[PDB]
């Protein structure tokens, strides 16, 4: 079978017979599990937070307010808030939030915003105009100078 080691400071280390599974129970309540598949699970007792590191670089954090975060090796971060909104942060600077009703809110580095409503209509906000596309094919644009243009469908 395995082996148990108890350190004078109270930290305990359990090792499986093959040594591929190691569980460290730190004196402060934290727990670290090293698995045979090389993933490392760390539990923070004070913060009640779980942190999983994968061999490919992926990291997952789970908070006690039911917030979860995924840090991808390519730089992408995905946050799932307690209200189940999902916010993705991309390496190129863009941000996308997906609401529970299916609405998508895209923030771009150039200051523009694109909203795709659950209704199929898209709305675009730029420095020069606000534009709303309707699924019947009509488009209304309100320019910065105040003029309003409605394009009717064919």
């Amino acid at each position: 079978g395995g082996r148990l080691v108890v350190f004078p400071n109270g930290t305990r280390k359990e090792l499986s017979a093959d040594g591929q599974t190691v569980k460290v129970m730190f004196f402060n309540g934290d727990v670290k599990h090293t698995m045979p598949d090389q993933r490392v699970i760390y539990y923070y007792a004070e913060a009640q937070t779980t942190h999983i590191t994968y061999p490919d670089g992926m990291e997952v954090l789970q908070f006690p307010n039911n917030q979860t975060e995924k840090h991808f090796p390519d730089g992408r971060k995905e946050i799932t808030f307690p209200d189940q909104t999902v916010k993705t942060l991309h390496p190129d600077g863009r941000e996308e939030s997906v609401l529970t009703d299916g609405t998508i809110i895209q923030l771009n580095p150039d200051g523009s915003k694109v909203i795709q409503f659950n209704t199929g209509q898209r709305e675009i906000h730029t420095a020069d105009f606000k534009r709303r596309e309707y699924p019947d094919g009509t488009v209304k644009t309100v320019y910065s100078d105040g003029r309003q243009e409605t394009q009717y469908p064919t």
Binding site: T11, K13, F26, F27, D30, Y44, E46, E69, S97
Partner: peptide, 16 residues
């Protein structure tokens, strides 16, 4: 050889 715990985590600061 070092089995001392990690420091406390913090949620990645969000706008909303």
């Amino acid at each position: 050889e070092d089995l001392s715990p990690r420091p406390s985590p913090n949620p990645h600061p969000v706008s909303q």
